[PDB]
């Protein structure tokens, strides 16, 4: 018996990019050519991408040709597929196989697979983000809690950049949804909270969301 | 360039039977085919390395044939082992391609599904997440269609489907469908509702139910 | 400028595997010994990996010594790094760095370095489920459902293995959480429901999660 | 190899002189370099060789020492050299960096003003409840938040972002978020944030009642 071991598979967002890789054991893979295979949710066999012995010659299938680069290393035994800006439809299981037979030729199938690892690309390439109001309880303190928006950035304003002394936008953490979440909050006499009114103007770019919101006290 | 014409999408069986699947390909090749068979989730595995040239290790039940366009495979009595995918390829220097893989499966009459829908317990809709679960329990073929409707609107990206292989006792698949919501969605509506259509069936097949009673 | 590119960042778990990659523009790599650094939580550097001209040497820092390996291939200009058997402290930004100089030496610093790409590991290695009835409308069918865990298999029985006809456990689905579900389901007599008390007995194998739940008329 | 950097942040005016300091644990010959490194940006190269400056490198910057002890000055800081420096030993096919130090710009001691704002009623109708605590214009940087429920100190849910000193003052802000499910949030009444900071003699607590 021989084996393969296909790596770095999981989630991933539609135009974002994943790189897989495969190891083997029980043999070398520098006297093989090295093949990327798929099966589509749909049930059917994709051949993906090819390198040759030597790593001299590098193909693809035509519908990965161009936004895929395959890869290898002859000495630790890893073969690679760098997946740029993916598709819905590269969802599916990936394996990778060695093109071989007991005597090798310049044409041979592919005589031992891997387990395969699956892909899926969710179909949400930006996400737009929710705005909630920090409602105001000397000097005051509001602002707005930018939520759940991808990629970066979001830019935030105050009163359509009328109001900037005292502003605070913090940089953005991610959570462990994969999303990001920022708050922009400004300090202001506590007297112009009857008559003032306060806008954050929220715009995030990669989703083309603009949102206006007044925060006013509860 | 080649594309497989690989035929039928699926072959029904059943333990004892002799077998034949056809590969054809789209513009001729020199007798470059090979057979693998595929069971579910798992690694492809190589039965013929060339056409008609059964691979080592291989059981003596497996056989094919090829003319340079039009190719077989063939199984000389199904044991319970083979009811799995097969694929054809034509394998190329630096490239492949594969036929649309003939489904082997076991045999039965049609059955239509018997359907259930499964309300969120209140336990999970605490929380604040609804699932709302539709159950085809047992039906034949595999092929069936699952809507969802929310107060009568039909639903377009909420569920998830998945379908369980051949029942070892009567052979039937089944699916379910599960429609995610959360409780401030779930609770903007009252009826909840799965509509059916399969193999069997005359009409189309609805369960439904409504929020709180 | 000389250009340098990294991919394949984002969010991983406690025991899992992740590939880096780097590539580059404005240069040819093969010249270059090769570096991967990152930029741990208190805002310090610490080195990861580097390989040398023509693949020869690999090292890499104690942390990472042999649960990471670094590949090269020049042919096409990239660099990756295998992550396998991630950990808490492993989470940072990652960059690809070229080793070099205005006139290339026996030993350099790091000269051109890549925009860098995060990497957050999750401790989240074995998260439980959480566990649902679903409960019966002359047959019936009730079940339990299973949301939110990782990594597979949730395992179910019917009330300790005492009931088996009928009993289907359905195939995991992957959600846009990153997360599996699944359901589990029996058909019974109808006439059985006001004497017979249906339980699922359930373990999440990995974190050994053992669960119950009783399955009854609401 | 190990190596130790001091001080781990160096506070200073604009126009000073200024020595960073890095300690190799055996010799390493001259064989350190210097890196910059600004916030959310890849390291920048300095000096080499101990004391080689990079061509386009300023010349305020200089670097000196050999065998164990190694320092970097900076000759007149300009608003651009505020950031954070690494020592880094280099051989022929491996490196190790020290711990970093970070200049910023020195002022008086500030107290944080602290603000603790309750989710909105929008968001917690989604099932969802952010609780942000607020920590406005303080310095210097090192502040500590702890977030306790009905006396119950948090830990694991809540993550922290701090801004860059302020142009204008010098001072440092930070928002912390506490996230938890419409379920989670009304099992809980009070909600508090407990800041400890070196202008605070004494933990300052603010705190609201569900509802
Ligand atoms: C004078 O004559 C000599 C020959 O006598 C000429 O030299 C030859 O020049 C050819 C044309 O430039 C080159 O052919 C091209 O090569 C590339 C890459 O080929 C790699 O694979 C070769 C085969 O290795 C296989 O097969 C053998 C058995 O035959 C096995 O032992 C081996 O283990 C390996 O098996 C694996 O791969 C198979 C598929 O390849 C699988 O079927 C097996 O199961 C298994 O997985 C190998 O020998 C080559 O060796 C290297 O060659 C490099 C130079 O090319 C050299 O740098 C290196 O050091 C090695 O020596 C390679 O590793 C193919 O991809 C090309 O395919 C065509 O590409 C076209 C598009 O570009 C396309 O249109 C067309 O359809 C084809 O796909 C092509 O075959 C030869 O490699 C080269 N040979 C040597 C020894 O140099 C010389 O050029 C000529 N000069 C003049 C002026 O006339
Ligand atoms: C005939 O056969 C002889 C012996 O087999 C060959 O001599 C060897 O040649 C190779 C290639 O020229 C040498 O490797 C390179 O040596 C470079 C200089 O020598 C080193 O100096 C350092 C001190 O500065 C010493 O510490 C080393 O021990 C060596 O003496 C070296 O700089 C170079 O570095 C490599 O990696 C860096 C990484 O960045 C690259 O930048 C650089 O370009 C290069 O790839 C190599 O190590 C080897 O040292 C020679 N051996 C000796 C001394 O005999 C002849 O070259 C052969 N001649 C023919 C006809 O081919
Ligand atoms: C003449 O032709 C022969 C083959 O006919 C070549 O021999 C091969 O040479 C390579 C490169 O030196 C060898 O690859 C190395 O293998 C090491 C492990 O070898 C043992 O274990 C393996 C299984 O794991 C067995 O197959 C093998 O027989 C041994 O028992 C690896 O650890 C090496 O990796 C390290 O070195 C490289 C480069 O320095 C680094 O990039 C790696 O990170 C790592 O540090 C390396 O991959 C190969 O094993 C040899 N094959 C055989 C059959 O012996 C000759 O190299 C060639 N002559 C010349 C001068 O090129």
Redesign the interface.
């Given at each position: 018996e021989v084996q393969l071991v296909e790596?770095?598979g999981?989630?991933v967002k539609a135009g974002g990019?994943?790189?897989?890789?495969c190891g083997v054991s029980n043999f070398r893979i520098s006297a093989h050519?090295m093949?990327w295979?798929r099966?589509v949710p749909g049930?059917?066999?994709?051949?993906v991408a090819?390198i040759?012995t030597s790593?001299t010659?590098?193909?693809y299938?035509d519908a990965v040709k161009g936004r895929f680069?395959v890869?290898?290393?002859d000495?630790?035994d890893?073969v690679?597929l760098?997946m740029?800006k993916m598709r819905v439809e590269d969802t599916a299981?990936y394996?990778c196989?060695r093109?071989g037979?007991?005597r090798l030729s310049?044409?041979?199938?592919?005589?031992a697979?891997?387990?395969?690892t699956?892909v899926?690309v969710?179909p949400?390439s930006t996400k737009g983000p929710?705005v909630?109001?920090?409602?105001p309880?000397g000097?005051a303190?509001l602002?707005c809690?930018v939520?759940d928006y991808f990629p970066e950035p979001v830019t935030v304003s105050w009163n359509s950049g009328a109001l900037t002394s005292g502003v605070?936008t913090?940089?953005?953490?991610?959570?462990?949804?994969?999303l990001y979440?920022?708050?922009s909050?400004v300090?202001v006499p506590s007297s112009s909270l009857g008559t003032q009114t306060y806008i954050c103007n929220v715009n995030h770019k990669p989703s083309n969301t603009k949102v206006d919101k007044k925060v006013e006290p509860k | 360039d080649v594309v497989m014409t690989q035929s039928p999408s699926t072959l029904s069986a059943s333990v004892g039977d002799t077998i034949t699947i056809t590969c054809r390909a789209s513009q001729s090749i020199e007798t470059?085919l090979?057979w693998?068979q595929?069971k579910p989730?798992?690694?492809?595995?190589?039965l013929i390395?060339?056409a008609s040239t059964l691979?080592?290790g291989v059981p003596s039940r497996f056989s094919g044939s090829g003319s340079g366009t039009e190719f077989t495979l063939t199984i000389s009595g199904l044991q319970f082992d083979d009811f799995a995918?097969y694929?054809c390829?034509h394998?190329?220097?630096?490239?492949?391609?594969?036929?649309?893989?003939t489904?082997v499966e076991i045999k039965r009459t049609v059955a239509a599904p018997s359907v259930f829908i499964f309300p969120p317990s209140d336990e999970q809709l605490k929380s604040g997440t609804a699932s709302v679960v539709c159950l085809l329990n047992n039906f034949y073929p595999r092929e069936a269609k699952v809507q969802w409707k929310v107060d009568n609107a039909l639903q377009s990206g909420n569920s998830q489907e998945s379908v369980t292989e051949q029942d070892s006792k009567d052979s039937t698949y089944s699916l379910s469908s599960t429609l995610t919501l959360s409780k401030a969605d779930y609770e903007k509506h009252k009826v909840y509702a799965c509509e059916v259509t399969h193999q069997g069936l005359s009409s189309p097949v609805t369960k439904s139910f409504n929020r709180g009673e």
């Open positions: 790596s770095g999981g989630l990019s994943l790189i897989l890789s050519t093949n295979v099966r049930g059917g066999l994709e051949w090819s040759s790593s010659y590098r193909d299938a680069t890869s290898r290393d000495l630790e890893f690679y760098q740029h299981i394996y196989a093109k037979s007991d310049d044409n041979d199938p592919f005589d697979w891997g387990p395969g699956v899926t969710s949400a929710s909630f109001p920090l409602a309880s000097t303190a602002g809690l939520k605070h913090f940089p953005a953490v991610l959570q462990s949804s994969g979440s920022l708050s909050v300090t | 470059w090979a693998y595929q989730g798992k690694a492809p595995k190589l390395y060339k691979k080592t995918t694929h390829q394998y190329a220097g630096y490239s492949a391609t594969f036929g649309q893989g489904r």
